[PDB]
Amino acid sequence: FDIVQVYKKFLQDDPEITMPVAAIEALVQLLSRSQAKTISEFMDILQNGSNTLKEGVQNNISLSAGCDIFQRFVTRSLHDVGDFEQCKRHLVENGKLFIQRARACRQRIAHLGYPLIRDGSVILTHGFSRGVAAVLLAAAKRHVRFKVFVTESRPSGSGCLMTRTLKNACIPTCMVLDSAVSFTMNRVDLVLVGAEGVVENGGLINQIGTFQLAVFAKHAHKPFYAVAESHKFVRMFPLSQYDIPFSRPILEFDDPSPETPTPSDAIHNELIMNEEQIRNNPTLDVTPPEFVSGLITDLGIIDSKSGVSEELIKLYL
Amino acid sequence: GPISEFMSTINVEHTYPAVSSLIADLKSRKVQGPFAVAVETALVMRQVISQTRWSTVDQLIDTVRAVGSTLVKAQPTEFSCGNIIRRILRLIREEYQELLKTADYSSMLNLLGRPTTGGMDMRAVIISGIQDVIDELDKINTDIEVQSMDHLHSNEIILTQGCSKTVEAFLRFAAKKRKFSVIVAEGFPNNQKGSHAMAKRLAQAGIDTTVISDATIFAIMSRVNKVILGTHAILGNGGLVTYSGAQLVAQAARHHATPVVVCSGIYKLSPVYPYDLESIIQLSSPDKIMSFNEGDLISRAEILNPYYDYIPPDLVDLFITNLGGYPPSYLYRIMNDTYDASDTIL
Amino acid sequence: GPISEFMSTINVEHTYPAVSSLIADLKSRKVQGPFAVAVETALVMRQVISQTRWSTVDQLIDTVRAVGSTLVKAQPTEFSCGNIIRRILRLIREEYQELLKTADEMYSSMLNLLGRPRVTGGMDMRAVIISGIQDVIDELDKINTDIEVQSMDHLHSNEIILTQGCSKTVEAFLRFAAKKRKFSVIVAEGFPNNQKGSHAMAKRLAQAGIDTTVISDATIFAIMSRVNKVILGTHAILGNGGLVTYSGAQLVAQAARHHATPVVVCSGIYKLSPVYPYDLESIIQLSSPDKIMSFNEGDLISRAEILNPYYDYIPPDLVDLFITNLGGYPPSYLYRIMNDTYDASDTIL
Amino acid sequence: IFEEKQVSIFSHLDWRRRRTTENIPKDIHPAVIRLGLKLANYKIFGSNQRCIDLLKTFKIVIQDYQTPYGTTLSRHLTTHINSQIAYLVSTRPLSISMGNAIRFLKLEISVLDIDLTDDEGKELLLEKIDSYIRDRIIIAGQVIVQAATEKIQDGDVILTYLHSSTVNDVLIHAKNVGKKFRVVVVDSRPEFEGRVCLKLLTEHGIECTYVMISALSYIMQEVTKIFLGGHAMLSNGALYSRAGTSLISLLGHESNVPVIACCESYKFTERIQLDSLVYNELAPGDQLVNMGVDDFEEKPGVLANWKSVKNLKLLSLKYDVTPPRLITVCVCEMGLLPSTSVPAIINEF
């Protein structure tokens, strides 16, 4: 059934979908084509299916979150004198009626987020995030006068896409290098980032340059807001900002044996790292909750971030 | 959605005389401060529930929300008003839902699942719940002052600013048994007169009180064991809307590793997220910091007198409330069990 | 360039019997501790100058530099030894240099870059060299006397002072303020190494009329909230301003920073060494497991690694004030103090 | 008056103890008496075992408990229990785990609604004592162990302080499942519980290093993970454990080492203290007399007559409040949570 192929399938299907939701839709259309009819048969199922899904995509955190939400909805109404089939249709029936809220969650976020931008302020964002864009755009329509710094986000290069996205809405933009983010913090009134996933302690898993912005923000005494939908909450507890499942081997060294001038103003765009080297660098980092001012979700703005824990507590019994 | 719509002015005056008088006194700053506004609003609501006639719960809800919206706009930085409203709004909603089925978990799982006589003469019940609020608003100083035997100990030095009946009752209760010291930074220019009066009352209880200028706050901070502050309101992000100069105490405390304790009733807790501090901070008259008879000075210089000060949520270590002592991280759960999170915007 | 190369050891013996004897007692650690090492080194150097005969000044300098070198490598973590050597070396150069002025008829290091590229060099400088050496030995005997008097500026009534281990300098500091002012001192035992010493000092502090409390090292954090000042002694102060001090002091310093409590250090300037702490692994010494785990615990010691370091390291940023015999100075100004007491060439001995 | 709050910052801490049975009240059950002796004497067991023994004893109490027929079971069983408690708290102040199990039992004393023959009444009671011991302590502990064990990675150098049942179980279990790691045991004065730990862990064939708390800074550079057992977890997210625990967590933080608190849910408390001094437990000052390497080997100490010496006071606190910002994660049977989410769990019971 090649669940993986499907999961990737939505992802291209619809730019506005989230990796967790794409995993939920995956399991649904497996639950459609799933002959099943044994709880043993019925529940043996996805687990090999999300497992197969988890092992089929290399960075798996976000889809694992959407997964984790799915089965807990499954067993919690399979508990309850649970019959199988009524959930099997009801999930396949309302699958369209899932990527409904997921889209409504983002809009709910933007309606909560945009007042954080007030007249004459300068925003800083790292890379491209649909949620961040949603918040910024929603503020723009209300004729709010603001400007946005966008970090050239290597390796993804998401900075260009976000810059153009904001340029289309007549929002004044300016791109900054990953090395110049600290120098710009004095001109920044607010920092706004998205997140692929939010861990148990309310920490952020996102693009590799995220935590550096949160660090500069803390140092420059500027508010740092994260933008993520509720279904990005995942039960996993990184013990450091380095503790995550690695897709590829990372940060390993050369082994040379006897193997046989630049000014600072000089601009050498041809002097960047190659992709062989870049595949040795991480794709994601972790941002501790003590760097996050408030976490904007569809559930509202979570400042406690013992509250993200509260939600994951409710999810599991 | 206010009550200027859905009702005329003269209709409001006749039907809800209390609402009209509260609006006038909220704008004129007659009714003033968290406690006075809380009580008055709750009494005005008792009239609204008594007078208003509806057949549907929804009519009642939006009627209250409309009156709430109007009372809020009258004086928006007196968060105490809206909180009492939101409290009653929730009180109405679940009195309804248990009446709903006497006639027989997570918000994360809502993403996946099922899509899609009630209102009248529960009035008698609603009015009772309003009285329950009045009673609780009286027990605030008693429910809080008792906890002073867990934090205030002998020979400790305590720093306080301005005047807080809550903090005062807190201190004096421990003071009738244990002997300690209190440094009172006056709240110049605003809480000035009141703090001096409180300082005298403390000393009369034998608490060894010292009255210092606001500029002395840092200098004495090194010898202070604990900071105990009152507040005007606690906002949605756990922040603190409090009286002028209180951040001087807060910042200096964090710099000297001194714990910051806040004494406040739960009713001062508002779901209003501070998207701003400018709209939060109100400015009184420049008369308080500069005499008007300084003709040259007042015509040649911007003279500003903030009434409130803001304190970021992460500068408070402990909240002493009527419910008990809680960390700032727990204010999240305090709200979700008090208001209904749709009335956050009234 | 040690003394073995210059001469056979057999006659670094009959020519310098005090040196070979001191080297032996330095390695066996019979003469240990900053003060004892400093005095004995100065005394040995005195009989070295007394008996050496070096007619051009460069023979003296090379002699003392070489002799001092082997004294250094005998016990490298007793920096007070090398410090005394560096003092005597500058004593000679400057004195001689002053002598050079006597016959008649830099100031920036940066400026030097553009700078441009003896008569009657002499012996029998002994009188003045021995004089200055005897002086230094005296100036070592006055460290406590003019340090303790500064206590009236930092020790006041009803304050609470946290200290750790045993420090004769700190003890003097406390007792000098104790005669006129009554305060409190919490003494953290320096277990396992400064245990008895601190327990003994604590008794004397109590006898001096100081409210003394004796606590275990674990209790340090627990009582930090009611402590006004931390007063520590040190074994040595390195080039970067870091402290080579006795074990457990990191507990105090870290807990002090956390509670925003000032850390004061009382130490004579002779404990100020120019050596840079490149590797702390070479600075921290380890004594016997005996002090921590008993030897009759055969099974435990056979199945476990037991480690007893008796030195701790404090980074210079955790010291607010240095109380010295030269006065009170910030860790920043130690830079210039070394420049005034040592010649830069003697940094590596 | 029964009160003494003076200039001594330790004056309020309850120092009154009962070491013998002399004049023991008559209504005290034998099983309660022996528990009172072991609580006041043993060096060997802490909050977890204290709670288990307390409950099992109270079953014997209730089992041997005979109803008078001037009243019946519900009104007077709670009074007889209160008598046993009053005696026990006089031998040693109640642990949080014990106090919480007391509120549990007392609540379940009352809720039985004037129902049953007493014997049936006894019969259930022992049931949720049996079940309380089952679910809240033993089962939960096993959950914590496997939750914590999977955080252990191959090559880990794990630090445990003192002697903790929960942490010991985690480590032992970890090697049983075949994890490659070594343990660093940090001990402290007066009594050395880390030895009991070191003894246990080496008998299970685990690679171990043993140091005193004074050598914390040194040994921390080898440590990759820190595991802590808790006497109680405070509602502000702070960890309330043994006296040196905060120092472990503080220096651990400075070395970027994760601090992992392992505590059963029933040891959570509504109590919030801002320092380690308001709520604590005094240990006998005479414990600090023994010169160090061993305890109860009879060595006299300079401080032995400290009771008679004015201005000399010995002191050892048993516990320690570790601030929330120093705890990385709290591992209970609810899973791995931020320590700040403790008061939330108390609502889910």
Q: Which residues pair with A285 in a beta bridge?
A: A206
* Backbone angles phi and psi of B80, in degrees to 5: -55, -40
Reading the block at residue D116, the tokens are 């049953």
Residue D211's SS3 state is strand
Longest dimension (CA), chain B: 76
C-alpha closest to that of A178 among A102, A81, A101, A281: A281
Task: Select from C226, C228, C259 the Cβ nearest to the Cβ of B257.
Answer: C259
Q: Which residues pair with C211 in a beta bridge?
A: C184
Task: Select from A98, A102, A116 the Cβ nearest to the Cβ of B275.
Answer: A116
Between CA A213 and CA A126 the distance in angstroms is 8
Between CA C27 and CA C10 the distance in angstroms is 18
Chains that touch C (3 or more CB pairs under 8 A): B, D
* Residues A275 and A307 reside in one and the same domain: yes
Between CA A123 and CA A172 the distance in angstroms is 10
* Residues A95 and A145 reside in one and the same domain: no
DSSP D254-304: HTT--EEEE--GGGB-S---SSSSSS--EEPGGGGTS-TTSSSS----TTT
Q: Is the preceding peptide bond at B189 cis, omega within 30 degrees of 0?
A: yes
Between CA C333 and CA C343 the distance in angstroms is 17
Cβ partners under 8 Å of residue D65, min gap 6? D77, D80, D122
DSSP state of C284: S
Residues in chain A: 317
Dihedral angle over CA of D196, D198, D201, D202, nearest 10: -120
* Residues D307 and D165 reside in one and the same domain: yes
- Measuring CA to CA, how many Å separate B302 from each of B215, B286, B296, B298, D294? 22, 9, 12, 7, 73
Chain D contact set for C247 (CB, 8 A): 214-215, 218
- Give the distance from CA C185 to its chain's centroid: 24
Reading the block at residue C303, the tokens are 């199945």
Q: C289 to chain D, minimum CA–CA distance in Å?
A: 9
Reading the block at residue D39, the tokens are 């609580």
Cβ partners under 8 Å of residue A169, min gap 6? A136, A137, A140, A141
* Residues A105 and A166 reside in one and the same domain: no
Q: Sort C96 into a burial class: Cβ within 10 Å, 0-12 / 13-18 / 19+.
A: buried
How many folded domains does chain D comprise? 2
CB contact under 8 A, A306 and B112: no
Residue B210's SS3 state is strand
Cβ partners under 8 Å of residue B23, min gap 6? B70, B71, B74
Between CA B128 and CA B84 the distance in angstroms is 14
Between CA B175 and CA B198 the distance in angstroms is 14
End residue of a domain, out of D108, D143, D178: D143
SS3 per-residue string spanning A2-68: CHHHHHHHHHHHCCCCCHHHHHHHHHHHHCCCCCCCCHHHHCCCCHHHHHHHHHHCCCCHHHHHHHH
Q: Is the C-alpha dihedral spanning A263, A267, A268, A273 positive or negative?
A: positive
Contact C318, C256 (CB under 8 A): yes
Between CA C72 and CA C78 the distance in angstroms is 8
Between CA A54 and CA A67 the distance in angstroms is 9
Its domain, for residue A273, covers 111-315
Cβ partners under 8 Å of residue D107, min gap 6? none
Contact B217, B185 (CB under 8 A): yes
C243-246 and D335-337: which strand pairing? unpaired
Reading the block at residue D18, the tokens are 């009962």
Contact A193, A206 (CB under 8 A): yes
Q: B156 to chain C, minimum CA–CA distance in Å?
A: 10
Chains D and B: 3 or more CB pairs within 8 Å of each other: yes
End residue of a domain, out of A110, A133, A151: A110
* Backbone angles phi and psi of B161, in degrees to 5: -130, 150
Q: A146: alpha, beta or left, given left = phi > 0 and alpha = psi -120 to 50?
A: beta
Contact D97, D231 (CB under 8 A): yes
Q: Which residues pair with A122 in a beta bridge?
A: A147
* Residues D2 and D148 reside in one and the same domain: no
How many folded domains does chain A comprise? 2
* Residues D92 and D198 reside in one and the same domain: no
Residues in chain D: 349
CB contact under 8 A, A289 and D338: yes
Please report, as a single letter, which amino acid is at residue B305: N
* Residues D139 and D160 reside in one and the same domain: no
* Residues D218 and D120 reside in one and the same domain: no
Contact D247, C218 (CB under 8 A): yes
Strand order in the sheet with C229-232: C327-329, C321-324, C263-266, C229-232, C160-164, C184-188, C211-215, D312-317, D282-283
Q: Sort B77 into a burial class: Cβ within 10 Å, 0-12 / 13-18 / 19+.
A: middle
Task: Select from D151, D325, D338 the Cβ nearest to the Cβ of A239.
Answer: D151
End residue of a domain, out of A110, A136, A161: A110
Its domain, for residue D318, covers 144-349
* Residues A146 and A244 reside in one and the same domain: yes
Chains that touch B (3 or more CB pairs under 8 A): A, C, D
Contact C83, C273 (CB under 8 A): yes
Q: Which long-range contacts (CB under 8 A, 24 or more apart) does D26-32 make?
A: D27/D80, D27/D83, D28/D83, D28/D84, D28/D87, D29/D57, D29/D60, D29/D61, D29/D64, D29/D84, D31/D57, D31/D60, D31/D61, D32/D57, D32/D61, D32/D84, D32/D87, D32/D88
What angle do the packed helices C57-74 and C17-27 form, to 10 degrees?
20
DSSP state of D95: P
Between CA A237 and CA A244 the distance in angstroms is 9
* Residues A169 and A70 reside in one and the same domain: no
End residue of a domain, out of D118, D143, D168: D143
Dihedral angle over CA of C88, C89, C92, C97, nearest 10: -140
* Residues A268 and A251 reside in one and the same domain: yes
DSSP state of B269: B
Between CA B19 and CA D60 the distance in angstroms is 65
The b-or-e profile of A30-41 (16+ CB within 10 A means b, else e) is bbeebebeeeee
The b-or-e profile of B212-221 (16+ CB within 10 A means b, else e) is bebeebeebb
Query: Would you list which residues of chain B are within 8 Å, Cβ to Cβ, of chain D?
Result: 150-151, 153-155, 178-179, 226, 259, 261, 317-318, 324-327, 329-330, 333
C-alpha closest to that of C130 among C88, C184, C102: C88
Dihedral angle over CA of C95, C96, C97, C101, nearest 10: 100
Q: Is the C-alpha dihedral spanning A65, A71, A77, A79 positive or negative?
A: negative
DSSP C96-111: HHHHHHH------STG
Chain breaks in chain A (C to N over 2.5 A) after: 260
* Residues A55 and A199 reside in one and the same domain: no
Q: Which residues pair with D336 in a beta bridge?
A: D331
Residue C276's SS3 state is coil
Residue D71's SS3 state is coil
DSSP state of D93: P
Q: Which residues pair with B85 in a beta bridge?
A: none
What angle do the packed helices D47-64 and D165-176 form, to 10 degrees?
110
A224-227 and A294-297: which strand pairing? parallel
Cβ partners under 8 Å of residue B165, min gap 6? B35, B141, B230
Q: Sort C306 into a burial class: Cβ within 10 Å, 0-12 / 13-18 / 19+.
A: buried
* Backbone angles phi and psi of C89, in degrees to 5: -65, -40
Chain D contact set for C159 (CB, 8 A): none
Contact C188, D284 (CB under 8 A): no
- Structure-token match 């509720």, residue found: A230
Q: Sort C221 into a burial class: Cβ within 10 Å, 0-12 / 13-18 / 19+.
A: buried
* Backbone angles phi and psi of B30, in degrees to 5: -70, -65
Q: Is the C-alpha dihedral spanning D186, D188, D194, D195 positive or negative?
A: positive
Identify each DSSP E strand in A157-291 by its residue range.
173-176, 190-194, 197-198, 204-207, 224-227, 284-287
CB contact under 8 A, A311 and B112: no
Count CB neighbours of B55 within 10 A: 11
* Residues D113 and D231 reside in one and the same domain: no
* Residues D221 and D315 reside in one and the same domain: yes
Contact C189, C214 (CB under 8 A): yes
Chains that touch D (3 or more CB pairs under 8 A): A, B, C
- Measuring CA to CA, how many Å separate B200 from each of B153, B156, B212, B245? 21, 19, 13, 21
Between CA D143 and CA D148 the distance in angstroms is 9
Residue B289's SS3 state is coil
C-alpha closest to that of C252 among C330, C136, C143, C161: C161
Between CA B72 and CA B84 the distance in angstroms is 11
Strand order in the sheet with D207-212: C304-306, D207-212, D181-187, D156-161, D225-229, D259-262, D329-332, D335-337
CB contact under 8 A, B324 and D270: yes
Q: Sort A223 into a burial class: Cβ within 10 Å, 0-12 / 13-18 / 19+.
A: middle
Report how this structure was experimentally obtained.
X-ray
Strand order in the sheet with D239-242: D232-233, D239-242, D319-322
CB-hemisphere CA count at 13 Å for C106? 5
* Residues A215 and A249 reside in one and the same domain: yes
* Interchain CB contact of D6 with B (< 8 Å): yes
* Residues D227 and D95 reside in one and the same domain: no
Q: Which long-range contacts (CB under 8 A, 24 or more apart) does D80-83 make?
A: D80/D27, D81/D105, D81/D106, D81/D109, D83/D25, D83/D27, D83/D28
CB contact under 8 A, D340 and B324: no
DSSP C5-45: HHS-GGGTTSS-HHHHHHHHHHHTTSS-SHHHHHHHHHHHH
Among the residues of chain D, which ranges form H helices?
30-41, 47-64, 73-91, 96-111, 118-131, 140-149, 165-176, 193-203, 216-220, 245-254, 342-345
Q: Which residues pair with D283 in a beta bridge?
A: D316
Task: Select from A239, A240, A309 the Cβ nearest to the Cβ of D337.
Answer: A309
Count CB neighbours of D263 within 10 A: 28
Between CA B64 and CA B89 the distance in angstroms is 7
- Measuring CA to CA, how many Å separate D273 from each of A205, D238, D264? 34, 9, 20
* Residues D84 and D203 reside in one and the same domain: no
Interface test with C, best of D159, D302, D311, D325 (most C CBs within 10 A): D311
- Structure-token match 């996993």, residue found: A236
C-alpha closest to that of A306 among B261, D342, D262: D342
Chain D contact set for B226 (CB, 8 A): 274
* Backbone angles phi and psi of B115, in degrees to 5: -90, 145
CB contact under 8 A, B332 and A302: yes
* Residues A82 and A186 reside in one and the same domain: no
C-alpha closest to that of D301 among C291, C197, C220, C247: C197
* Residues A176 and A215 reside in one and the same domain: yes
Q: Is the C-alpha dihedral spanning C5, C10, C11, C15 positive or negative?
A: positive
Between CA B182 and CA B154 the distance in angstroms is 11
* Residues D120 and D225 reside in one and the same domain: no
Reading the block at residue A282, the tokens are 């991480």
* Backbone angles phi and psi of B182, in degrees to 5: -130, 125
CATH code of the domain in which A77 resides: 1.20.120.1070
* Residues A194 and A215 reside in one and the same domain: yes
Reading the block at residue D12, the tokens are 């309020």
Count CB neighbours of C127 within 10 A: 8
Interface test with D, best of C157, C158, C166, C219 (most D CBs within 10 A): C219
Chains A and D: 3 or more CB pairs within 8 Å of each other: yes
C-alpha closest to that of B237 among B321, B335, B164, B307: B335
Between CA A26 and CA A4 the distance in angstroms is 8
Q: Which residues pair with C306 in a beta bridge?
A: D210
Q: Is the C-alpha dihedral spanning B255, B257, B263, B268 positive or negative?
A: positive
Reading the block at residue C214, the tokens are 């004796």
Reading the block at residue C30, the tokens are 């019979």
End residue of a domain, out of D143, D176, D205: D143
CB contact under 8 A, B325 and D5: no
Residue A226's SS3 state is strand
* Residues D92 and D125 reside in one and the same domain: yes
- Structure-token match 């007078």, residue found: B51
CATH code of the domain in which A239 resides: 3.40.50.10470
The b-or-e profile of D36-47 (16+ CB within 10 A means b, else e) is beebeeeeeebb
* Residues D99 and D217 reside in one and the same domain: no
End residue of a domain, out of A110, A136, A163: A110
Between CA B249 and CA B252 the distance in angstroms is 5
